[PDB]
mmCIF file with all atom_site columns, C-alpha atoms and ligand atoms in Angstrom:
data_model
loop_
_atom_site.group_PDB
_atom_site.id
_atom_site.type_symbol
_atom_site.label_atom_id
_atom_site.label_alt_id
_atom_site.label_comp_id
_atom_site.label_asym_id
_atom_site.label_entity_id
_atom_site.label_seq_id
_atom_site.pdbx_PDB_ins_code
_atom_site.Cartn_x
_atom_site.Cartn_y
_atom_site.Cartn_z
_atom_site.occupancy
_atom_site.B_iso_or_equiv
_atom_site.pdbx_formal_charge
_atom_site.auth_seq_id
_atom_site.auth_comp_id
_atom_site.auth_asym_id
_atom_site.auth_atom_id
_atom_site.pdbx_PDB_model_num
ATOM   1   C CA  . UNK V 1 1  ? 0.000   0.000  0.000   1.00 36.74 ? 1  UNK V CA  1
ATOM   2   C CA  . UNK V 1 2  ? 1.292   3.412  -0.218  1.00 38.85 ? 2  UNK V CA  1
ATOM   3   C CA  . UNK V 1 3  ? -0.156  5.786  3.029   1.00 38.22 ? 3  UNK V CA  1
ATOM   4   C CA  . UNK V 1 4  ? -0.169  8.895  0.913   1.00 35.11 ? 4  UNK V CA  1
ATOM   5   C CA  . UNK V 1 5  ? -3.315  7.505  -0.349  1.00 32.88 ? 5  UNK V CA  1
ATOM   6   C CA  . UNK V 1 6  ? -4.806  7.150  2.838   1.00 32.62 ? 6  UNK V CA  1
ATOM   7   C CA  . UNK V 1 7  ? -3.607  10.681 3.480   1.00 33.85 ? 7  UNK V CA  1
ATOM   8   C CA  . UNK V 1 8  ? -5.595  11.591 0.255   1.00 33.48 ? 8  UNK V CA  1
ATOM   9   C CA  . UNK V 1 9  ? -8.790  9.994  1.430   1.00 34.02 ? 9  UNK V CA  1
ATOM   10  C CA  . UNK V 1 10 ? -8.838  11.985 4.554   1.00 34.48 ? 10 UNK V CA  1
ATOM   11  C CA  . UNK V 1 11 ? -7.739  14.901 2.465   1.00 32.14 ? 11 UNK V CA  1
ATOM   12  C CA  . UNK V 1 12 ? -10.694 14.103 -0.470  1.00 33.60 ? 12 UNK V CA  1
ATOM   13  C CA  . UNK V 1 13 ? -13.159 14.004 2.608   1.00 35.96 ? 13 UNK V CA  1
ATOM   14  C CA  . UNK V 1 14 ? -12.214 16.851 3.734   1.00 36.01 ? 14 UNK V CA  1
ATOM   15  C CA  . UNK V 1 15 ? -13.555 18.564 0.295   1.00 36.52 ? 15 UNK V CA  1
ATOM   16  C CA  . UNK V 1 16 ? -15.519 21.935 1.150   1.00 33.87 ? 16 UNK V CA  1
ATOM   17  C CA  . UNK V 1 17 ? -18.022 19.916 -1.417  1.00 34.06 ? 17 UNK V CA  1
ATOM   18  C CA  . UNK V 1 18 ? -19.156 16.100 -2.772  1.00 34.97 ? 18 UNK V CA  1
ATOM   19  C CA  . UNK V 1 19 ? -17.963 16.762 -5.895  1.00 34.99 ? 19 UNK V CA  1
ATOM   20  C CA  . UNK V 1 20 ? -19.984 15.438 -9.026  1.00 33.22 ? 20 UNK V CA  1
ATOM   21  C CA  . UNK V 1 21 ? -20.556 12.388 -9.766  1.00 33.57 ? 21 UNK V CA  1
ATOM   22  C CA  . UNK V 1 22 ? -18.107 11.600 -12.330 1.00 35.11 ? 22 UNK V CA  1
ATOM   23  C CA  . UNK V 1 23 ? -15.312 12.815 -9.751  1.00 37.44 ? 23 UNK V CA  1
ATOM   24  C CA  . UNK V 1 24 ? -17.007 11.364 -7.105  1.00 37.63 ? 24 UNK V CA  1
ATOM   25  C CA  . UNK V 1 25 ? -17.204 7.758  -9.124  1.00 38.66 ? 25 UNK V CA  1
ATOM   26  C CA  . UNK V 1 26 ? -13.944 7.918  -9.825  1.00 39.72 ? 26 UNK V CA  1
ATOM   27  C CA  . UNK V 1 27 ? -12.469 8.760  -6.152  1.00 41.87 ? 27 UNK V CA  1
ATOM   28  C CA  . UNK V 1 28 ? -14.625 5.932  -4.905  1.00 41.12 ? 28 UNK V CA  1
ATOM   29  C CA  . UNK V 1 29 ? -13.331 3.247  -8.074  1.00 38.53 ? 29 UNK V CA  1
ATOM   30  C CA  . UNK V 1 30 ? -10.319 3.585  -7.324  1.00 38.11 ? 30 UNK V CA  1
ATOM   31  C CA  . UNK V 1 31 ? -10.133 4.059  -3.488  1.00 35.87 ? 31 UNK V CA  1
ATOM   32  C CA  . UNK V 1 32 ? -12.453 0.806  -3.817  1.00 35.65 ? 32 UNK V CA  1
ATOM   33  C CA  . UNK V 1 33 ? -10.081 -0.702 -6.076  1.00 33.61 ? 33 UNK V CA  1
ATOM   34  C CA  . UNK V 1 34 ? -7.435  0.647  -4.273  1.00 34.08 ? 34 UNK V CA  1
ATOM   35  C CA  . UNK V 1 35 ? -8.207  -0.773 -0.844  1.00 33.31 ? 35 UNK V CA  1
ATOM   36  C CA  . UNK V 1 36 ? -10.758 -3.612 -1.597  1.00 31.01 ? 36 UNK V CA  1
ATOM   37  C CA  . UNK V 1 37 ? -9.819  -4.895 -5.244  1.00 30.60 ? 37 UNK V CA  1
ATOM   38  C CA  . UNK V 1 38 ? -12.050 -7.599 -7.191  1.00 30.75 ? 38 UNK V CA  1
ATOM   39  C CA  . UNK V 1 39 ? -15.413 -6.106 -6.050  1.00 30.22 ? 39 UNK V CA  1
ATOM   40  C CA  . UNK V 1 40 ? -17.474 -8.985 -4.579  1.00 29.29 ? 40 UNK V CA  1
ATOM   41  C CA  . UNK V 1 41 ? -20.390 -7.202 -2.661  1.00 28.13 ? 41 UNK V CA  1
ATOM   42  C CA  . UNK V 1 42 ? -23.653 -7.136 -4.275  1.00 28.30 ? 42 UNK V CA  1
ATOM   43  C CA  . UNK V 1 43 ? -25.628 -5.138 -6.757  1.00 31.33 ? 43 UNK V CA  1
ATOM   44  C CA  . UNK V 1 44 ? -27.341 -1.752 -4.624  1.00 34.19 ? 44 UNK V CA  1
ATOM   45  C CA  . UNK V 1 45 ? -30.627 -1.943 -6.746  1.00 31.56 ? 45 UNK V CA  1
ATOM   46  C CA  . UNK V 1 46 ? -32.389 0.228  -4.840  1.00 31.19 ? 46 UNK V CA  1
ATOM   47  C CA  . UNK V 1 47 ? -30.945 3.381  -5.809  1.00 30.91 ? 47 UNK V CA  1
ATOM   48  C CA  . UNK V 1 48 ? -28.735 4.216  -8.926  1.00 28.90 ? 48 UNK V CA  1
ATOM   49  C CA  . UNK V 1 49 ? -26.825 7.058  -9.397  1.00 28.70 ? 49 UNK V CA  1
ATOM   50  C CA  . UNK V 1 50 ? -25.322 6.092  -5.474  1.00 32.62 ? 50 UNK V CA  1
ATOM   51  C CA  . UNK V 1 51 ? -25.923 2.505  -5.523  1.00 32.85 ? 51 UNK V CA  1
ATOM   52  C CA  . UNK V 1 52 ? -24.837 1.362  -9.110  1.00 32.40 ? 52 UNK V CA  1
ATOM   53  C CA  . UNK V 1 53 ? -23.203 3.939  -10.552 1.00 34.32 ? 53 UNK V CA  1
ATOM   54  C CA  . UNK V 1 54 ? -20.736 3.654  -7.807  1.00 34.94 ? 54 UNK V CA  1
ATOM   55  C CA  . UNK V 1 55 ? -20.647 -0.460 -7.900  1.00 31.60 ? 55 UNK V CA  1
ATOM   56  C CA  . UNK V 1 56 ? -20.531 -0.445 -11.468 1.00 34.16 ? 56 UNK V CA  1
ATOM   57  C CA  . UNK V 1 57 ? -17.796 1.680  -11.606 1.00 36.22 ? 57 UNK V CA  1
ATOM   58  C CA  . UNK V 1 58 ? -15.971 -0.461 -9.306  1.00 39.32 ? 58 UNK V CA  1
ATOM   59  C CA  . UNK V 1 59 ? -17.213 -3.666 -10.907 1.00 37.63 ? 59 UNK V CA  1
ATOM   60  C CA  . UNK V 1 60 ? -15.289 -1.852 -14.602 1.00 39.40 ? 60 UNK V CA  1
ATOM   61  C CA  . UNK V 1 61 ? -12.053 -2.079 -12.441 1.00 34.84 ? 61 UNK V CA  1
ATOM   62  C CA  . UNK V 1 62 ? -12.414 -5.698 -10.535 1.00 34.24 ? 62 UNK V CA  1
ATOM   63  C CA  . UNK V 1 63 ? -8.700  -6.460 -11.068 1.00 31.70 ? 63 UNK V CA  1
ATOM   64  C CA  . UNK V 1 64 ? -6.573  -3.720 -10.228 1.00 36.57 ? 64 UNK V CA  1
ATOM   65  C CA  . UNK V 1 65 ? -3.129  -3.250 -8.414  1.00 40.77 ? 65 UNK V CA  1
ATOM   66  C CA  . UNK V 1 66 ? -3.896  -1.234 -5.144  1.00 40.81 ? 66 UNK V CA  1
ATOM   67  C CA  . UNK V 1 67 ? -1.168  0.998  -6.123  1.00 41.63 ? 67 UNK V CA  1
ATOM   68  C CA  . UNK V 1 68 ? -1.705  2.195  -9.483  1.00 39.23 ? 68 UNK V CA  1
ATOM   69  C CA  . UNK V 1 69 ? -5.137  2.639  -8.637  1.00 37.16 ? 69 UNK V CA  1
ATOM   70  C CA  . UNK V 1 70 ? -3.566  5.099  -5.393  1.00 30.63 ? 70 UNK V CA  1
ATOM   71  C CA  . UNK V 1 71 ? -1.509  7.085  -7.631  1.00 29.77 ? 71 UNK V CA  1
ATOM   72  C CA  . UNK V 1 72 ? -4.744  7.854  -9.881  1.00 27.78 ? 72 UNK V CA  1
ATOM   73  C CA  . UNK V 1 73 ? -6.859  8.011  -6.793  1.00 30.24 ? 73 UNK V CA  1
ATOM   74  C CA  . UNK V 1 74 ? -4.018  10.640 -5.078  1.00 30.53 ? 74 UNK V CA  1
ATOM   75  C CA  . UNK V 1 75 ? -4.046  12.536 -8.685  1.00 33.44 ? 75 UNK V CA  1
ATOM   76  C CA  . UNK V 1 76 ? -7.726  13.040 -8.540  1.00 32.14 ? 76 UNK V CA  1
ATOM   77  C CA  . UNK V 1 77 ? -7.901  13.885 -5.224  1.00 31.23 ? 77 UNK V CA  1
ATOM   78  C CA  . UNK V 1 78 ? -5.080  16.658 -6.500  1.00 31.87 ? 78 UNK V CA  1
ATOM   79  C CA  . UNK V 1 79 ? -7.305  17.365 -9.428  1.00 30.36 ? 79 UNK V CA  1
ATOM   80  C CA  . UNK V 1 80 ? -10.362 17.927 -6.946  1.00 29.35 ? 80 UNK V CA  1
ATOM   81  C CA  . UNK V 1 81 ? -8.248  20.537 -4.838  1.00 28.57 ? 81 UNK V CA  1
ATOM   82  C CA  . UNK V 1 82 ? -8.278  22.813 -8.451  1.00 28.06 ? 82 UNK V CA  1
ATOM   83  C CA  . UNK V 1 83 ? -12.061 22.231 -8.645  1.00 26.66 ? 83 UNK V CA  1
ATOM   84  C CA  . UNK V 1 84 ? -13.022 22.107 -4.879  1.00 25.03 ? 84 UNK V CA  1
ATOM   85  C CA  . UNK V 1 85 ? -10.482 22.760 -2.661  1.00 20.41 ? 85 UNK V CA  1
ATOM   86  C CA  . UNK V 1 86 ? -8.144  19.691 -1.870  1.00 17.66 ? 86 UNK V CA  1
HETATM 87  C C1  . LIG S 2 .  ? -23.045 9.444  -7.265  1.00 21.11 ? 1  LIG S C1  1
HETATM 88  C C2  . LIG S 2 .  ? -22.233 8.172  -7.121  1.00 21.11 ? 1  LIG S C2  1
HETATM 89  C C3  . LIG S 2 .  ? -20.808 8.371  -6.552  1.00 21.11 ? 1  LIG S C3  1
HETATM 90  C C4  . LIG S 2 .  ? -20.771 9.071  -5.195  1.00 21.11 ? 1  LIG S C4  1
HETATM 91  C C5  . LIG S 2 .  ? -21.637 8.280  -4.181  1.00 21.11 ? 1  LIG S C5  1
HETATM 92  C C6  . LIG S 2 .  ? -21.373 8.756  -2.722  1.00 21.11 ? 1  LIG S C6  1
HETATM 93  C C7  . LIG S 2 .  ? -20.117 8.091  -2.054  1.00 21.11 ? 1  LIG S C7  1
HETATM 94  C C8  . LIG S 2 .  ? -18.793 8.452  -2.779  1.00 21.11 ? 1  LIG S C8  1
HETATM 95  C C9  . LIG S 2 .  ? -17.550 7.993  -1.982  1.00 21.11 ? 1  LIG S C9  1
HETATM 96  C C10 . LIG S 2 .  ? -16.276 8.606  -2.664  1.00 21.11 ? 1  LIG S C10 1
HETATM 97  C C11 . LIG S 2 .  ? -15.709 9.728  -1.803  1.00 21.11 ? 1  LIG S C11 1
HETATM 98  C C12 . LIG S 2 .  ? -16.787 10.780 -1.652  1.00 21.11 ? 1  LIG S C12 1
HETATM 99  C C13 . LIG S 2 .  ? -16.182 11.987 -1.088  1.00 21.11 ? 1  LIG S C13 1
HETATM 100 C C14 . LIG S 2 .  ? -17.378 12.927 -0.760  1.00 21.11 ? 1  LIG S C14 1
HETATM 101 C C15 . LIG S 2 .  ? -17.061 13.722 0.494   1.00 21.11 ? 1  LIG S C15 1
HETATM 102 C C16 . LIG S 2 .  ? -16.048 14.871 0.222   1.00 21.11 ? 1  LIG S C16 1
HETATM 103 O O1  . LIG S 2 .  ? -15.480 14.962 -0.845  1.00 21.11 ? 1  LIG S O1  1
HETATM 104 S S1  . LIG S 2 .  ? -15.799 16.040 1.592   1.00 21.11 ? 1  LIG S S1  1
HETATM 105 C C17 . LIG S 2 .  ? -17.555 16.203 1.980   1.00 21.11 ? 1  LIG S C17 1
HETATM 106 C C18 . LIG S 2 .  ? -18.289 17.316 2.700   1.00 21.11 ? 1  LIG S C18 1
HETATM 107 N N1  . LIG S 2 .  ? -19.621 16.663 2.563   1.00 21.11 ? 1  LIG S N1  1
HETATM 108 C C19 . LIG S 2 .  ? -20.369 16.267 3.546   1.00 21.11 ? 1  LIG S C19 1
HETATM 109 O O2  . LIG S 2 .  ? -20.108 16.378 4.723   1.00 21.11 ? 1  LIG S O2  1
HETATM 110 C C20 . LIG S 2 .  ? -21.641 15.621 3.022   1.00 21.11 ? 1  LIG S C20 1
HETATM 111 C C21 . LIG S 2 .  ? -21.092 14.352 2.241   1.00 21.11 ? 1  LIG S C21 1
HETATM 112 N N2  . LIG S 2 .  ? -20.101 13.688 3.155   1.00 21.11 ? 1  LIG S N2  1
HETATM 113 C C22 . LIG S 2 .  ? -19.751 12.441 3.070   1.00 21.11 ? 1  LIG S C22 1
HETATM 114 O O3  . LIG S 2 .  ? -20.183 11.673 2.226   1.00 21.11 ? 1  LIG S O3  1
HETATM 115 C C23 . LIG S 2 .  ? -18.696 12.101 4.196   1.00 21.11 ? 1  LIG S C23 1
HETATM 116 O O4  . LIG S 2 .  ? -19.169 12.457 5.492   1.00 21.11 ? 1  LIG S O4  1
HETATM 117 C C24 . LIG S 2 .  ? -18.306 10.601 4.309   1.00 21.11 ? 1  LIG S C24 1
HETATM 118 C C25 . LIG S 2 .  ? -19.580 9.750  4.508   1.00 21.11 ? 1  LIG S C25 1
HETATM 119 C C26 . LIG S 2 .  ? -17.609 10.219 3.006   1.00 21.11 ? 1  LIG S C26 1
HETATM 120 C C27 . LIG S 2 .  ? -17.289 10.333 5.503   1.00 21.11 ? 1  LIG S C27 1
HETATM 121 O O5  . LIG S 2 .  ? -16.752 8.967  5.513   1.00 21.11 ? 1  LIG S O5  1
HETATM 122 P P1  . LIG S 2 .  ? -16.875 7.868  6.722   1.00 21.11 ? 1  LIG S P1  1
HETATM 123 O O6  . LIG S 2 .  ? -17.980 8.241  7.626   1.00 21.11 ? 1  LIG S O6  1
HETATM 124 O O7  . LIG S 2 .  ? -15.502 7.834  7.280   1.00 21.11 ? 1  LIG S O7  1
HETATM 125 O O8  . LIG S 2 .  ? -17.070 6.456  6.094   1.00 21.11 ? 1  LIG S O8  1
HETATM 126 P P2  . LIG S 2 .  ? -18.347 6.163  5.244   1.00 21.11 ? 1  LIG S P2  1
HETATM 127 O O9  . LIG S 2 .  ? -19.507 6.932  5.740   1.00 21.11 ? 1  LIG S O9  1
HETATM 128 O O10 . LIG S 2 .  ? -18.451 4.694  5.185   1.00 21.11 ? 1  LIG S O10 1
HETATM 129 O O11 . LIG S 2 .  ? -17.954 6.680  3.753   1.00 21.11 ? 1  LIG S O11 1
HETATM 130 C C28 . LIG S 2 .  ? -18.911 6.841  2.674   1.00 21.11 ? 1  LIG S C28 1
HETATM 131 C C29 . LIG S 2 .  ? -18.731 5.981  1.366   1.00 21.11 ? 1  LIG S C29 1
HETATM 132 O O12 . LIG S 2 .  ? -17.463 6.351  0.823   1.00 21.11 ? 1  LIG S O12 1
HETATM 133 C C30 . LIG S 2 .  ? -16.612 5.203  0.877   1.00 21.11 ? 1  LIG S C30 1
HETATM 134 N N3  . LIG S 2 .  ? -15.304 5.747  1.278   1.00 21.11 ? 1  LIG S N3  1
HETATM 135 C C31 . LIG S 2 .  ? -14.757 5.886  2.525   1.00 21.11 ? 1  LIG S C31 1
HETATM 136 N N4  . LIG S 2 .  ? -13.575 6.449  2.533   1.00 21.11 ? 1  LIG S N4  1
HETATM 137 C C32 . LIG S 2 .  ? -13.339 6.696  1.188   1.00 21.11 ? 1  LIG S C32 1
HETATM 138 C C33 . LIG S 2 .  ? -12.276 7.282  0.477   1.00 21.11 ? 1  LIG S C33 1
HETATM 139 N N5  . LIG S 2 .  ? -11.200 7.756  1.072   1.00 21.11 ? 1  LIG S N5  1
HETATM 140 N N6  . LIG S 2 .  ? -12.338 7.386  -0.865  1.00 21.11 ? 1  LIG S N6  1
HETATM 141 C C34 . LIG S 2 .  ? -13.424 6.922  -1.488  1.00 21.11 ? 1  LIG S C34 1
HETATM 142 N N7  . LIG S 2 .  ? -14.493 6.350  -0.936  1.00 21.11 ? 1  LIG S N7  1
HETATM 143 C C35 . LIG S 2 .  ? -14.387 6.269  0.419   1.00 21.11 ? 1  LIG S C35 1
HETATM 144 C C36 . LIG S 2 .  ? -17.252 4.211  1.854   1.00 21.11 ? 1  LIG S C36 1
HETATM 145 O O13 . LIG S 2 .  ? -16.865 2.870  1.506   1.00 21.11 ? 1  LIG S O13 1
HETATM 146 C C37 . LIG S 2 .  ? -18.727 4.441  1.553   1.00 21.11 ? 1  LIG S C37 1
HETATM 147 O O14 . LIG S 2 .  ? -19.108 3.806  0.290   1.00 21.11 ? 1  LIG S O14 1
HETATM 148 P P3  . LIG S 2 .  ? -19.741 2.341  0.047   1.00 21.11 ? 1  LIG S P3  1
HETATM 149 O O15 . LIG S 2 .  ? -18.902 1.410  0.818   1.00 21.11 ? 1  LIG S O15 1
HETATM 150 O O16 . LIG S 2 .  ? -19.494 2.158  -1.381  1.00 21.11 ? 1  LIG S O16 1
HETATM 151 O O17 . LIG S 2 .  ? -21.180 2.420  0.345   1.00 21.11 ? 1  LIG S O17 1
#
């Protein structure tokens, strides 16, 4: 693992803002990916644009290195700060 992305998610939390979706979805891909890996929780259902959306998304990146999927994580997490702060 490399901390610095657990540094970012406190740091992405910390966002003045949720930022949109697409932001959003990809923070939580790849701090999914990042952390969990081959998703293997179910399907939401219920709601979509925070229950699948935000599966599927994860689900499109099942097999992923933890690391690779930090350093993007981190670099959105630096793009966010542009858009809403950190
Ligand atoms: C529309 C579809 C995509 C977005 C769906 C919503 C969830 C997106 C998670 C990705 C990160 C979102 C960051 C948004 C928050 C900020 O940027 S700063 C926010 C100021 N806003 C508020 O106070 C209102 C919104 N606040 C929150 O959502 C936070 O209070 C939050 C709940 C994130 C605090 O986290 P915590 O209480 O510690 O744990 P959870 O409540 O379990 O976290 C919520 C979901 O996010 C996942 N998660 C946890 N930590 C991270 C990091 N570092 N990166 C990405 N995702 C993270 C949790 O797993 C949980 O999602 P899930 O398990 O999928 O249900």
């Amino acid at each position: 693992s490399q901390a610095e992305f657990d540094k970012a998610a406190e740091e992405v939390k910390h966002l003045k803002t949720k930022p949109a979706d697409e932001e959003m979805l990809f923070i939580y891909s790849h701090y999914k990916q990042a952390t969990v890996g081959d998703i293997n929780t179910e399907r939401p259902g219920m709601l979509d644009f925070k229950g699948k959306a935000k599966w599927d998304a994860w689900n499109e990146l099942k097999g992923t290195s933890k690391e690779d999927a930090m350093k993007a994580y981190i670099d959105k997490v630096e793009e966010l700060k542009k858009k809403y702060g950190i």
